[PDB]
Design an enzyme around this catalytic site. Structure first.
Site, short mmCIF file in Angstrom:
data_model
loop_
_atom_site.label_atom_id
_atom_site.label_comp_id
_atom_site.label_asym_id
_atom_site.label_seq_id
_atom_site.Cartn_x
_atom_site.Cartn_y
_atom_site.Cartn_z
N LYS A 138 0.85 -1.17 0.00
CA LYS A 138 0.00 0.00 0.00
C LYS A 138 0.90 1.24 0.00
O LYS A 138 0.69 2.17 -0.80
CB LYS A 138 -0.88 0.02 1.25
CG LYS A 138 -1.70 1.31 1.41
CD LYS A 138 -2.58 1.26 2.68
CE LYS A 138 -1.78 1.63 3.95
NZ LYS A 138 -1.44 3.10 3.99
N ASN A 139 1.93 1.23 0.85
CA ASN A 139 2.81 2.39 0.96
C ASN A 139 3.91 2.60 -0.09
O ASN A 139 4.79 3.45 0.06
CB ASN A 139 3.36 2.48 2.38
CG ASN A 139 2.26 2.73 3.41
OD1 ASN A 139 1.15 3.10 3.04
ND2 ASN A 139 2.57 2.57 4.69
N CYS A 143 -3.87 13.66 14.03
CA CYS A 143 -3.99 12.24 13.74
C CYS A 143 -3.94 11.51 15.09
O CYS A 143 -3.12 11.81 15.92
CB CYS A 143 -2.91 11.70 12.73
SG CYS A 143 -2.91 9.87 12.54
N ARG A 174 2.22 14.41 14.02
CA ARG A 174 2.74 14.11 12.69
C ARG A 174 2.88 15.35 11.82
O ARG A 174 2.22 15.49 10.79
CB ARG A 174 1.86 13.08 12.00
CG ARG A 174 1.74 11.76 12.79
CD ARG A 174 0.92 10.69 12.07
NE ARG A 174 1.60 10.13 10.90
CZ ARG A 174 1.05 9.24 10.07
NH1 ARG A 174 -0.19 8.81 10.30
NH2 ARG A 174 1.71 8.80 9.01
N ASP A 220 4.55 -0.52 11.93
CA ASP A 220 3.34 -1.09 11.34
C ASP A 220 3.15 -2.57 11.67
O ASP A 220 2.16 -3.15 11.28
CB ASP A 220 3.33 -0.87 9.81
CG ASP A 220 3.01 0.59 9.43
OD1 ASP A 220 3.17 0.94 8.24
OD2 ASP A 220 2.58 1.38 10.30
N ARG A 246 -8.91 0.55 4.86
CA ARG A 246 -7.95 1.51 4.28
C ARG A 246 -6.58 0.86 4.15
O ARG A 246 -5.79 1.25 3.28
CB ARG A 246 -7.74 2.74 5.17
CG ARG A 246 -8.83 3.76 5.21
CD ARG A 246 -8.41 4.90 6.13
NE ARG A 246 -7.15 5.52 5.69
CZ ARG A 246 -6.50 6.49 6.34
NH1 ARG A 246 -6.96 6.98 7.49
NH2 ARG A 246 -5.40 6.99 5.82
C1 LIG Z 1 1.47 6.57 3.54
C2 LIG Z 1 2.62 5.94 4.30
O1 LIG Z 1 3.59 5.50 3.64
N1 LIG Z 1 2.55 5.88 5.69
C3 LIG Z 1 3.64 5.25 6.51
C4 LIG Z 1 4.82 6.23 6.76
O2 LIG Z 1 4.26 7.39 7.46
P1 LIG Z 1 5.02 8.76 7.51
O3 LIG Z 1 4.30 9.85 8.20
O4 LIG Z 1 5.32 9.20 6.12
O5 LIG Z 1 6.46 8.60 8.06
P2 LIG Z 1 7.63 9.39 8.77
O6 LIG Z 1 7.82 10.64 7.93
O7 LIG Z 1 8.67 8.31 8.68
O8 LIG Z 1 7.83 9.79 10.28
C5 LIG Z 1 7.82 9.04 11.45
C6 LIG Z 1 8.13 10.08 12.60
O9 LIG Z 1 8.78 11.30 12.00
C7 LIG Z 1 8.04 12.48 12.33
N2 LIG Z 1 8.08 13.56 11.25
C8 LIG Z 1 7.85 13.23 9.88
C9 LIG Z 1 7.87 14.15 8.89
C10 LIG Z 1 8.15 15.57 9.22
O10 LIG Z 1 8.19 16.50 8.41
N3 LIG Z 1 8.37 15.86 10.61
C11 LIG Z 1 8.36 14.93 11.66
O11 LIG Z 1 8.57 15.26 12.83
C12 LIG Z 1 6.66 11.95 12.60
O12 LIG Z 1 5.85 12.85 13.34
C13 LIG Z 1 6.91 10.62 13.32
O13 LIG Z 1 7.24 10.80 14.71
O14 LIG Z 1 5.83 5.58 7.59
C14 LIG Z 1 5.34 5.09 8.91
C15 LIG Z 1 6.53 4.48 9.65
O15 LIG Z 1 7.04 3.38 8.90
C16 LIG Z 1 4.15 4.11 8.71
O16 LIG Z 1 3.69 3.68 9.99
C17 LIG Z 1 3.05 4.82 7.90
O17 LIG Z 1 1.94 3.92 7.73
C18 LIG Z 1 0.67 4.61 8.10
C19 LIG Z 1 0.21 4.00 9.40
C20 LIG Z 1 -0.36 4.43 7.00
O18 LIG Z 1 -0.20 3.57 6.16
O19 LIG Z 1 -1.38 5.15 6.94
#
Ligand SMILES: CC(=O)N[C@H]1[C@@H](OP(=O)(O)OP(=O)(O)OC[C@H]2O[C@@H](n3ccc(=O)[nH]c3=O)[C@H](O)[C@@H]2O)O[C@H](CO)[C@@H](O)[C@@H]1O[C@H](C)C(=O)O
Length: 420
Positions: free
Chosen positions: A22-23, A117, A122, A307, A399
């Site tokens: 999905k991702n 969220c 996030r 995940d 989803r």
């Molecule tokens: C669509 C998709 O690919 N989503 C996935 C991706 O989310 P994401 O948000 O992109 O990944 P992050 O940027 O790696 O971040 C993880 C951490 O980094 C912080 N951060 C992120 C970006 C930013 O600008 N500033 C900042 O602070 C953030 O707050 C968190 O603490 O990566 C996650 C971890 O593997 C998954 O759990 C998530 O699946 C979900 C469930 C789903 O499929 O719906």
């Protein structure tokens, strides 16, 4: 409001077909905003997130539909609108990915700023910051992140101070059309990132280093198109392997990718599972044994993925022994624990850590889903608990998993989708 009625006390065994991640599909679909020629994507799972993404793409002027073979055919040759609206973005924050390509190819783009969220804080500060490094001017007007750039973006060195899957992808997408070379240090290494980069490369991009913390992109004027089969979903695979691990069953996952689950596979083995890996399949045989509790610490790839955290929390809750589960990605992703405690599970939470004490049998009752990936733990719990279990608000489950009832029933579960 749909719910699942699940009748437990059955070992889950058999074969299940793994779909595309999905991702990987989501970022690939947004990266597709860059394509000037037709795109054909195969192995794209059938789940809500894909449908939402298609709705966002269509209102930008992209023509895209899944045909009868299951393939997703996309034509982004005539995008005439550059805003991902609030009404769609609020349902799936990943839509933030529309900004980078729109800005890189059309020099302007607008996307609703994601709000709150449940699972945690996030922000998307790193995405914005990275785009600004490439030369974009960005302002926030009326709830919208508005980006603009007078000329083509400019490639430069960017060190993302935090490991971020999303920011690594926004920046990489934008960099493919920047002038000169961009370097992304401290890049997230997730397999989905490797897949998007491969997809972009098939359209004329020039990305090397994907999968490592050091990505190099040599910008080009424009991208064309291609046919691309999405990388198998490691999370869906993990989930079904756990299905066997928590029920003492034996499960074979077809069309898997060997090396995207090392952390998960090692933990399953630490838990007492026998796991057989071939190039295109992964088989877990729990040999009718109860699991042995294992500690868990989530972290960016290749560490243990967040995940898969709930799925393993469930494994520990029925394992033999005490376990420590620490979540370092999302500080509030333990919503399943109290739902699982309603079923007989034993766990205490303290901050970003949960100390679980494994019990022999869970017992069915009603529980509520709230996390598109994590809540799957509640359905699996229904499969192995005594009596009946009712999982409410499964729309969350839809989803993040395709044909979940069919695949589970295919492994022997007694699950029916109903309403009211
Ligand atoms: C669509 C998709 O690919 N989503 C996935 C991706 O989310 P994401 O948000 O992109 O990944 P992050 O940027 O790696 O971040 C993880 C951490 O980094 C912080 N951060 C992120 C970006 C930013 O600008 N500033 C900042 O602070 C953030 O707050 C968190 O603490 O990566 C996650 C971890 O593997 C998954 O759990 C998530 O699946 C979900 C469930 C789903 O499929 O719906």
């Amino acid at each position: 409001m749909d719910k699942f009625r699940v009748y437990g006390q059955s070992r889950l065994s058999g074969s299940v077909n793994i779909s595309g991640a999905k991702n990987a599909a989501l970022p690939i679909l947004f990266a597709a905003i860059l394509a000037t020629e037709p795109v054909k994507l195969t192995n794209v799972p059938e789940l809500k997130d894909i449908e939402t993404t298609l709705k966002i793409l269509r209102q930008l002027g992209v023509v895209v539909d899944r045909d009868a073979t299951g393939a997703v055919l996309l034509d982004a040759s005539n995008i005439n609108h550059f805003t991902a609206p609030y009404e769609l973005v609020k349902t799936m924050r990943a839509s933030i990915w529309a900004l980078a390509p729109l800005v890189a190819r059309f020099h302007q783009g607008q996307v609703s700023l994601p709000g709150g969220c449940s699972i945690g804080a996030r922000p998307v500060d790193l995405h914005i910051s990275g785009l600004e490094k490439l030369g974009a001017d960005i302002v926030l007007e009326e709830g919208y992140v508005k980006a603009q750039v007078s000329d083509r973006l400019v490639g430069t060195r960017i060190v993302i101070e935090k490991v971020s899957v999303g920011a690594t992808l926004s920046i990489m997408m934008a960099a493919t059309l920047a002038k000169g070379t961009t370097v992304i240090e401290n890049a997230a290494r997730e397999p989905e990132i490797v897949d998007t980069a491969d997809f972009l490369n098939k359209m004329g991009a020039k990305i090397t280093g994907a999968g490592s913390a050091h990505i190099t992109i040599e910008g080009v004027e424009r991208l064309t198109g291609c046919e691309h089969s999405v990388v198998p979903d490691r999370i869906e695979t993990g989930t079904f392997l756990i299905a066997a691990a928590i029920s003492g069953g034996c499960v074979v996952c077809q069309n898997t990718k060997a090396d995207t689950l090392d952390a998960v596979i090692d933990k399953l083995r630490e838990a007492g599972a026998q796991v057989d890996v071939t190039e295109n399949s992964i088989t877990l045989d729990m040999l009718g044994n109860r699991p042995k509790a294992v500690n868990i610490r989530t972290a960016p790839h290749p560490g243990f993925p967040t995940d898969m955290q709930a799925q393993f929390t469930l494994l520990n809750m029925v394992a033999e022994g005490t376990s420590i589960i620490t979540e370092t990605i999302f500080e509030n992703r333990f919503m399943h624990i109290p739902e699982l405690i309603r079923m007989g599970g034993k766990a205490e939470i303290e901050g970003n850590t949960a100390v679980c004490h494994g019990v022999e049998q869970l017992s069915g009752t009603e529980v509520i889903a709230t996390d598109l990936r994590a809540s799957i733990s509640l359905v699996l719990a229904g499969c192995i608990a005594t009596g009946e279990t009712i999982v409410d608000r499964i729309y969350h489950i839809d989803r993040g998993y395709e044909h979940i009832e069919d695949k589970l029933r295919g492994l022997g579960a007694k699950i029916e989708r109903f309403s009211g």
